[PDB]
Short mmCIF file of C-alpha atoms in Angstrom, two decimals:
data_model
loop_
_atom_site.label_atom_id
_atom_site.label_comp_id
_atom_site.label_asym_id
_atom_site.label_seq_id
_atom_site.Cartn_x
_atom_site.Cartn_y
_atom_site.Cartn_z
CA UNK A 1 138.81 117.35 49.97
CA UNK A 2 140.15 115.34 52.92
CA UNK A 3 143.84 115.13 53.92
CA UNK A 4 144.63 111.71 55.42
CA UNK A 5 148.35 111.23 54.66
CA UNK A 6 150.76 112.29 57.42
CA UNK A 7 154.21 113.43 56.27
CA UNK A 8 155.49 109.87 56.74
CA UNK A 9 152.28 108.64 55.13
CA UNK A 10 153.08 110.93 52.20
CA UNK A 11 156.48 109.22 51.95
CA UNK A 12 155.01 105.69 51.84
CA UNK A 13 151.93 106.92 49.95
CA UNK A 14 152.91 104.61 47.09
CA UNK A 15 152.41 101.37 49.04
CA UNK A 16 149.31 102.69 50.83
CA UNK A 17 147.35 103.71 47.72
CA UNK A 18 148.10 100.24 46.31
CA UNK A 19 146.64 98.45 49.33
CA UNK A 20 143.71 100.88 49.40
CA UNK A 21 142.96 100.19 45.73
CA UNK A 22 143.12 96.48 46.51
CA UNK A 23 140.30 97.26 48.93
CA UNK A 24 138.50 99.82 46.71
CA UNK A 25 138.67 97.05 44.13
CA UNK A 26 136.26 95.20 46.40
CA UNK A 27 138.63 92.24 46.91
CA UNK A 28 138.35 92.05 50.69
CA UNK A 29 140.67 89.15 51.58
CA UNK A 30 143.37 90.67 49.38
CA UNK A 31 142.99 94.13 50.93
CA UNK A 32 143.03 92.75 54.47
CA UNK A 33 146.29 90.85 54.09
CA UNK A 34 147.78 93.60 51.92
CA UNK A 35 147.14 96.21 54.62
CA UNK A 36 148.18 93.83 57.41
CA UNK A 37 151.63 93.40 55.89
CA UNK A 38 152.06 97.18 55.73
CA UNK A 39 151.10 97.42 59.40
CA UNK A 40 153.83 94.87 60.10
CA UNK A 41 156.43 96.57 57.88
CA UNK A 42 155.75 100.20 58.86
CA UNK A 43 153.95 100.00 62.25
CA UNK A 44 153.71 103.75 62.95
CA UNK A 45 151.61 104.63 59.91
CA UNK A 46 148.20 106.20 60.64
CA UNK A 47 146.80 105.43 57.17
CA UNK A 48 148.17 101.87 57.23
CA UNK A 49 146.28 101.22 60.48
CA UNK A 50 143.19 103.06 59.21
CA UNK A 51 143.16 100.81 56.15
CA UNK A 52 143.53 97.70 58.26
CA UNK A 53 140.51 98.81 60.31
CA UNK A 54 138.50 99.73 57.18
CA UNK A 55 139.12 96.25 55.79
CA UNK A 56 138.10 94.63 59.08
CA UNK A 57 134.89 96.69 58.96
CA UNK A 58 134.12 95.54 55.42
CA UNK A 59 134.91 91.91 56.29
CA UNK A 60 132.42 92.23 59.16
CA UNK A 61 129.65 93.52 56.91
CA UNK A 62 130.50 90.75 54.41
CA UNK A 63 130.46 87.94 56.99
CA UNK A 64 127.60 89.41 59.06
CA UNK A 65 129.98 88.93 61.98
CA UNK A 66 129.96 90.85 65.25
CA UNK A 67 133.23 89.31 66.47
CA UNK A 68 135.08 90.75 63.45
CA UNK A 69 133.45 94.16 63.86
CA UNK A 70 134.70 94.23 67.44
CA UNK A 71 138.27 93.91 66.17
CA UNK A 72 137.69 96.69 63.67
CA UNK A 73 136.54 98.91 66.55
CA UNK A 74 139.85 98.46 68.37
CA UNK A 75 141.86 99.04 65.18
CA UNK A 76 140.03 102.33 64.56
CA UNK A 77 140.98 103.14 68.15
CA UNK A 78 144.58 102.13 67.35
CA UNK A 79 144.81 104.71 64.56
CA UNK A 80 144.18 107.42 67.16
CA UNK A 81 147.12 106.12 69.22
CA UNK A 82 149.92 106.70 66.68
CA UNK A 83 151.83 110.01 66.77
CA UNK A 84 151.40 112.98 64.45
CA UNK A 85 148.04 111.92 63.03
CA UNK A 86 146.18 114.09 60.48
CA UNK A 87 143.12 115.63 62.11
CA UNK A 88 140.85 114.75 59.17
CA UNK A 89 141.89 111.11 59.51
CA UNK A 90 141.49 111.12 63.30
CA UNK A 91 137.96 112.48 62.99
CA UNK A 92 137.11 109.84 60.40
CA UNK A 93 138.43 106.90 62.40
CA UNK A 94 136.97 107.76 65.79
CA UNK A 95 133.60 108.70 64.28
CA UNK A 96 133.45 105.35 62.49
CA UNK A 97 134.37 103.63 65.75
CA UNK A 98 131.53 105.40 67.56
CA UNK A 99 129.05 104.41 64.84
CA UNK A 100 130.17 100.77 64.95
CA UNK A 101 129.97 100.72 68.75
CA UNK A 102 126.45 102.17 68.60
CA UNK A 103 125.65 99.45 66.06
CA UNK A 104 126.78 96.71 68.45
CA UNK A 105 124.80 98.34 71.28
CA UNK A 106 127.80 99.67 73.24
CA UNK A 107 125.93 102.93 73.73
CA UNK A 108 128.03 104.17 76.65
CA UNK A 109 131.23 103.10 74.88
CA UNK A 110 130.11 105.15 71.90
CA UNK A 111 129.39 108.07 74.22
CA UNK A 112 132.98 107.81 75.43
CA UNK A 113 134.38 107.88 71.90
CA UNK A 114 132.16 110.90 71.20
CA UNK A 115 133.27 112.77 74.33
CA UNK A 116 136.86 112.24 73.24
CA UNK A 117 136.07 113.59 69.77
CA UNK A 118 134.66 116.75 71.35
CA UNK A 119 137.81 117.11 73.47
CA UNK A 120 139.90 116.80 70.30
CA UNK A 121 137.84 119.12 68.07
CA UNK A 122 136.08 121.62 70.35
CA UNK A 123 134.94 123.74 67.40
CA UNK A 124 133.41 121.01 65.21
CA UNK A 125 129.71 121.46 65.96
CA UNK A 126 128.77 118.35 63.96
CA UNK A 127 130.65 116.34 66.58
CA UNK A 128 128.78 118.12 69.38
CA UNK A 129 125.53 117.12 67.66
CA UNK A 130 126.80 113.53 67.49
CA UNK A 131 127.71 113.65 71.19
CA UNK A 132 124.18 114.85 71.89
CA UNK A 133 122.83 111.79 70.14
CA UNK A 134 125.23 109.72 72.22
CA UNK A 135 123.64 111.09 75.38
CA UNK A 136 120.14 110.46 74.03
CA UNK A 137 121.12 106.85 73.30
CA UNK A 138 121.83 106.25 77.01
CA UNK A 139 118.74 108.11 78.22
CA UNK A 140 120.77 111.07 79.52
CA UNK A 141 118.36 113.68 78.21
CA UNK A 142 119.60 116.41 80.56
CA UNK A 143 123.16 116.32 79.20
CA UNK A 144 121.84 116.10 75.63
CA UNK A 145 119.78 119.21 76.31
CA UNK A 146 122.93 120.96 77.51
CA UNK A 147 124.90 119.90 74.42
CA UNK A 148 122.25 121.24 72.05
CA UNK A 149 121.88 124.47 74.04
CA UNK A 150 125.63 124.94 73.60
CA UNK A 151 125.45 124.30 69.85
CA UNK A 152 122.51 126.68 69.44
CA UNK A 153 124.18 129.51 71.38
CA UNK A 154 127.02 129.50 68.82
CA UNK A 155 125.12 128.42 65.68
CA UNK A 156 121.49 129.38 66.33
CA UNK A 157 120.09 128.15 63.00
CA UNK A 158 121.57 124.63 63.01
CA UNK A 159 118.63 122.43 62.09
CA UNK A 160 119.98 119.16 63.50
CA UNK A 161 120.33 120.73 66.95
CA UNK A 162 116.90 122.32 66.56
CA UNK A 163 115.01 119.10 65.83
CA UNK A 164 116.82 117.17 68.57
CA UNK A 165 116.26 120.01 71.05
CA UNK A 166 112.57 120.06 70.19
CA UNK A 167 112.44 116.30 70.72
CA UNK A 168 113.99 116.82 74.16
CA UNK A 169 111.54 119.58 75.09
CA UNK A 170 108.62 117.40 74.03
CA UNK A 171 109.95 114.54 76.15
CA UNK A 172 110.05 116.98 79.09
CA UNK A 173 106.36 117.81 78.55
CA UNK A 174 107.22 121.17 76.99
CA UNK A 175 105.08 120.25 74.00
CA UNK A 176 104.14 123.79 72.93
CA UNK A 177 107.73 125.01 73.16
CA UNK A 178 108.97 122.04 71.11
CA UNK A 179 106.82 122.76 68.05
CA UNK A 180 108.79 125.75 66.66
CA UNK A 181 112.13 123.97 67.14
CA UNK A 182 110.89 120.88 65.29
CA UNK A 183 109.36 123.04 62.56
CA UNK A 184 112.41 125.26 62.03
CA UNK A 185 114.83 122.34 62.06
CA UNK A 186 112.79 120.36 59.55
CA UNK A 187 112.43 123.53 57.46
CA UNK A 188 116.19 124.17 57.41
CA UNK A 189 116.68 121.07 55.26
CA UNK A 190 119.90 120.35 57.12
CA UNK A 191 121.44 116.85 57.05
CA UNK A 192 119.79 114.60 59.59
CA UNK A 193 116.54 116.57 59.78
CA UNK A 194 114.65 114.71 57.02
CA UNK A 195 113.73 112.00 59.53
CA UNK A 196 110.29 110.47 59.87
CA UNK A 197 110.69 110.60 63.65
CA UNK A 198 110.69 114.40 63.75
CA UNK A 199 107.61 114.60 61.53
CA UNK A 200 105.94 112.09 63.86
CA UNK A 201 106.79 114.14 66.95
CA UNK A 202 105.89 117.47 65.36
CA UNK A 203 102.48 116.14 64.33
CA UNK A 204 101.84 114.47 67.69
CA UNK A 205 102.75 117.66 69.56
CA UNK A 206 100.62 119.83 67.28
CA UNK A 207 97.66 117.49 67.72
CA UNK A 208 98.07 117.58 71.50
CA UNK A 209 97.87 121.38 71.51
CA UNK A 210 94.95 121.50 69.07
CA UNK A 211 96.96 122.85 66.13
CA UNK A 212 95.12 121.94 62.93
CA UNK A 213 98.37 122.36 60.96
CA UNK A 214 99.45 118.84 61.98
CA UNK A 215 97.92 117.14 58.94
CA UNK A 216 99.86 119.51 56.68
CA UNK A 217 103.07 118.21 58.26
CA UNK A 218 101.83 114.63 58.07
CA UNK A 219 101.22 115.23 54.36
CA UNK A 220 104.73 116.66 53.99
CA UNK A 221 106.16 113.59 55.69
CA UNK A 222 104.22 111.40 53.28
CA UNK A 223 105.64 113.35 50.34
CA UNK A 224 109.12 112.82 51.84
CA UNK A 225 108.49 109.06 51.95
CA UNK A 226 108.14 108.78 55.73
CA UNK A 227 104.43 107.92 55.84
CA UNK A 228 102.18 105.74 53.70
CA UNK A 229 99.76 108.68 53.41
CA UNK A 230 98.50 111.61 55.48
CA UNK A 231 96.41 109.11 57.47
CA UNK A 232 98.29 105.80 57.32
CA UNK A 233 101.50 106.36 59.26
CA UNK A 234 102.52 102.97 60.67
CA UNK A 235 106.21 102.10 60.85
CA UNK A 236 106.52 98.36 60.15
CA UNK A 237 104.75 97.69 56.87
CA UNK A 238 104.48 95.19 54.04
CA UNK A 239 103.86 96.57 50.59
CA UNK A 240 100.90 95.72 48.40
CA UNK A 241 98.31 95.43 51.17
CA UNK A 242 94.86 96.89 50.59
CA UNK A 243 94.73 100.11 52.60
CA UNK A 244 91.39 101.51 53.78
CA UNK A 245 90.42 102.68 57.28
CA UNK A 246 87.12 100.79 57.70
CA UNK A 247 86.32 97.28 56.49
CA UNK A 248 83.21 95.14 56.25
CA UNK A 249 83.37 91.52 57.46
CA UNK A 250 82.80 90.52 53.85
CA UNK A 251 85.87 92.44 52.69
CA UNK A 252 88.19 90.73 55.19
CA UNK A 253 86.92 87.26 54.32
CA UNK A 254 86.93 86.27 58.00
CA UNK A 255 83.16 85.88 58.09
CA UNK A 256 83.19 82.78 60.31
CA UNK A 257 85.24 84.62 62.96
CA UNK A 258 82.92 87.64 62.86
CA UNK A 259 79.91 85.34 63.15
CA UNK A 260 81.35 83.46 66.13
CA UNK A 261 82.03 86.75 67.90
CA UNK A 262 78.63 88.30 67.17
CA UNK A 263 76.59 85.16 67.85
CA UNK A 264 78.32 84.34 71.15
CA UNK A 265 78.72 87.94 72.25
CA UNK A 266 76.85 87.76 75.57
CA UNK A 267 79.13 84.88 76.57
CA UNK A 268 82.23 86.98 75.80
CA UNK A 269 80.71 89.88 77.72
CA UNK A 270 79.81 87.73 80.72
CA UNK A 271 83.29 86.26 81.09
CA UNK A 272 84.80 89.75 80.88
CA UNK A 273 82.31 91.19 83.38
CA UNK A 274 83.13 88.30 85.71
CA UNK A 275 86.83 89.18 85.59
CA UNK A 276 86.02 92.84 86.26
CA UNK A 277 83.86 91.84 89.22
CA UNK A 278 86.16 89.22 90.76
CA UNK A 279 89.66 89.78 89.32
CA UNK A 280 89.76 93.53 88.69
CA UNK A 281 93.56 93.48 89.00
CA UNK A 282 93.80 91.52 85.74
CA UNK A 283 92.69 94.74 83.98
CA UNK A 284 95.89 96.74 83.45
CA UNK A 285 95.68 100.46 82.64
CA UNK A 286 96.62 101.57 79.15
CA UNK A 287 99.53 103.95 78.62
CA UNK A 288 98.77 107.48 79.80
CA UNK A 289 100.76 108.82 76.84
CA UNK A 290 97.83 107.92 74.59
CA UNK A 291 95.31 109.06 77.19
CA UNK A 292 94.70 112.78 77.55
CA UNK A 293 92.39 112.03 80.49
CA UNK A 294 90.09 109.32 81.75
CA UNK A 295 90.05 105.72 82.96
CA UNK A 296 91.01 103.05 80.42
CA UNK A 297 92.19 99.48 80.98
CA UNK A 298 92.57 96.15 79.19
CA UNK A 299 92.61 92.41 79.92
CA UNK A 300 94.79 90.54 77.43
CA UNK A 301 94.13 86.95 76.34
CA UNK A 302 96.55 86.70 73.40
CA UNK A 303 99.68 88.79 72.85
CA UNK A 304 101.52 88.45 69.52
CA UNK A 305 100.36 84.90 68.89
CA UNK A 306 101.23 83.80 72.44
CA UNK A 307 98.28 82.67 74.55
CA UNK A 308 98.19 84.08 78.08
CA UNK A 309 97.32 80.87 79.91
CA UNK A 310 96.65 82.54 83.27
CA UNK A 311 94.28 84.93 81.49
CA UNK A 312 92.41 82.19 79.60
CA UNK A 313 91.71 80.58 82.97
CA UNK A 314 89.62 83.66 83.76
CA UNK A 315 87.88 83.67 80.35
CA UNK A 316 87.91 79.97 79.45
CA UNK A 317 84.95 79.75 77.06
CA UNK A 318 86.07 82.82 75.10
CA UNK A 319 89.54 81.34 74.71
CA UNK A 320 88.06 78.00 73.67
CA UNK A 321 86.04 79.91 71.07
CA UNK A 322 88.97 81.89 69.68
CA UNK A 323 91.15 78.80 69.29
CA UNK A 324 89.03 77.94 66.23
CA UNK A 325 90.48 80.96 64.35
CA UNK A 326 94.26 80.96 63.88
CA UNK A 327 93.84 84.09 61.76
CA UNK A 328 93.60 85.97 65.09
CA UNK A 329 95.26 83.74 67.71
CA UNK A 330 98.28 83.36 65.43
CA UNK A 331 98.54 87.03 64.47
CA UNK A 332 102.02 87.77 65.82
CA UNK A 333 101.49 91.49 65.14
CA UNK A 334 98.18 91.71 66.98
CA UNK A 335 96.35 91.11 70.24
CA UNK A 336 93.12 89.75 71.67
CA UNK A 337 91.95 91.70 74.70
CA UNK A 338 89.05 93.22 76.57
CA UNK A 339 89.14 97.03 76.71
CA UNK A 340 87.14 99.09 79.21
CA UNK A 341 86.85 102.88 78.98
CA UNK A 342 85.06 104.94 81.61
CA UNK A 343 83.35 108.29 81.11
CA UNK A 344 85.39 111.41 80.54
CA UNK A 345 88.09 109.59 78.56
CA UNK A 346 89.86 110.93 75.48
CA UNK A 347 92.45 108.88 73.61
CA UNK A 348 94.82 111.05 71.59
CA UNK A 349 94.86 110.50 67.81
CA UNK A 350 97.32 107.74 67.06
CA UNK A 351 98.43 104.97 64.72
CA UNK A 352 99.25 101.32 65.25
CA UNK A 353 102.75 100.00 64.63
CA UNK A 354 101.98 97.88 61.55
CA UNK A 355 99.74 97.65 58.50
CA UNK A 356 99.88 93.82 58.61
CA UNK A 357 96.86 93.53 60.90
CA UNK A 358 93.23 94.56 60.95
CA UNK A 359 91.54 95.31 64.26
CA UNK A 360 88.08 94.02 65.15
CA UNK A 361 86.03 95.62 67.92
CA UNK A 362 83.16 93.60 69.40
CA UNK A 363 80.85 95.79 71.44
CA UNK A 364 80.04 94.20 74.81
CA UNK A 365 78.61 97.04 76.96
CA UNK A 366 77.94 100.21 74.97
CA UNK A 367 76.15 103.18 76.61
CA UNK A 368 73.43 104.69 74.46
CA UNK A 369 75.38 107.90 73.78
CA UNK A 370 78.78 109.51 74.21
CA UNK A 371 81.08 106.77 72.89
CA UNK A 372 82.60 107.27 69.47
CA UNK A 373 85.67 106.27 67.47
CA UNK A 374 87.12 108.03 64.43
CA UNK A 375 89.40 106.40 61.86
CA UNK A 376 90.74 108.69 59.13
CA UNK A 377 87.79 110.99 58.31
CA UNK A 378 84.99 108.62 59.37
CA UNK A 379 83.61 108.57 62.92
CA UNK A 380 81.53 105.55 63.91
CA UNK A 381 79.96 103.97 66.98
CA UNK A 382 79.91 100.55 68.58
CA UNK A 383 76.80 98.38 68.83
CA UNK A 384 76.24 95.72 71.48
CA UNK A 385 76.98 92.36 69.87
CA UNK A 386 78.18 93.86 66.59
CA UNK A 387 81.68 94.06 65.13
CA UNK A 388 83.57 97.03 63.72
CA UNK A 389 86.69 96.48 61.62
CA UNK A 390 89.35 99.10 61.00
CA UNK A 391 92.97 99.24 59.89
CA UNK A 392 94.56 100.78 62.95
CA UNK A 393 97.59 101.73 60.85
CA UNK A 394 95.27 104.62 59.93
CA UNK A 395 95.14 107.40 62.51
CA UNK A 396 92.25 106.89 64.92
CA UNK A 397 90.85 108.72 67.94
CA UNK A 398 88.47 107.61 70.69
CA UNK A 399 86.08 109.50 72.96
CA UNK A 400 84.13 108.29 76.02
CA UNK A 401 81.67 110.86 77.36
CA UNK A 402 78.76 108.69 78.44
CA UNK A 403 77.30 108.24 81.93
CA UNK A 404 78.33 104.57 82.30
CA UNK A 405 81.28 102.34 81.42
CA UNK A 406 82.04 101.11 77.89
CA UNK A 407 83.33 97.56 77.39
CA UNK A 408 84.54 96.18 74.06
CA UNK A 409 86.40 93.09 72.87
CA UNK A 410 89.43 93.71 70.66
CA UNK A 411 90.38 90.96 68.18
CA UNK A 412 93.32 91.40 65.80
CA UNK A 413 93.60 89.47 62.53
CA UNK A 414 96.33 89.19 59.94
CA UNK A 415 95.70 91.48 57.01
CA UNK A 416 93.75 89.14 54.69
CA UNK A 417 96.03 89.78 51.68
CA UNK A 418 99.16 88.47 53.42
CA UNK A 419 100.04 85.04 52.11
CA UNK A 420 100.44 82.04 54.44
CA UNK A 421 104.22 82.16 53.96
CA UNK A 422 104.15 85.90 54.68
CA UNK A 423 102.29 85.26 57.95
CA UNK A 424 104.83 82.60 58.94
CA UNK A 425 107.91 84.68 58.10
CA UNK A 426 106.85 88.10 59.45
CA UNK A 427 108.86 88.79 62.63
CA UNK A 428 106.64 89.86 65.51
CA UNK A 429 107.27 93.33 66.86
#
């Protein structure tokens, strides 16, 4: 059990437990003023101050107020100021302060609180792990690496340190070295290791070193509630949405959109080819993280329901066409863009961020062989002037090993089972 009552505190324990029960009761206003009057009467009490701060914290969560939370943060700090403070209580108060600071985004302020905690309790390894997260939260991966190396020299089988250390190694491009750390840490079962993020990184690493075991771990993560299934692993999801990797135009209901794309495809192609030929700079490379190798770029017309006006100048007829279909131009979780992939390209298996969209691919220039795209367990090919539809919340992988360039048109639509109100109220990402 925890010991919070200083000797003095033990003396005035009677008043303090009363105010604390006033809080524990759930009557926040009462507890606040209760505790405040104790602070006034006995101003040196650590538990009196700690209760004041606890009440401020609860009032902040009740009022959804940042300005109140900021006062709680200082009062937690105040507790640490008073003399002869129980160590248990000190730990509690400063840890809560760090968590609230992190919540408000004061990442470096939290790091400071955490550094102090390590100064106070050099032998509490949990606090070293928390400090390591503090460093991660400011991008200081080198110091985080050092913190976790410390922890692991003294407690080699600490799973929290292991998973975070593996994450660090993988962010340093030591992908093979990171896999055992991630595995062992997840396998320890330790608090803080049952995190979808570590399953994600373990599986991504394994896939990038050709380790077939990845799907096993994906499956485990699904069983732990981190993934929708072994295949469908998006992060921002809405429940109750039909979930299959490949769709027919008929199944989406957006048959008029598919028809407009397929029937006017040479127009869409020609505008894109014109931008390649004359405004090549408008094609921005895709993220090399996803790309093992190759040459892969895109020209974006709509981003998250926002039309790119300077882009639609370069593809004016295609934009005029798309305007007729708010199911795609208003998809705030999707895009509309040209995508060009040159030979020798491999896009790592990956998943889109949401299950609230379906992704259409219109084939504009498709070499006769060498281009293929897998979603879940089905691998398909593009056809010039024909549309593919997949749920890119399902893992998918792309290969370009033709002798010429491959050009497609990417059109995102709201998942057809989302209601109008759902489409209006879904925050873009």
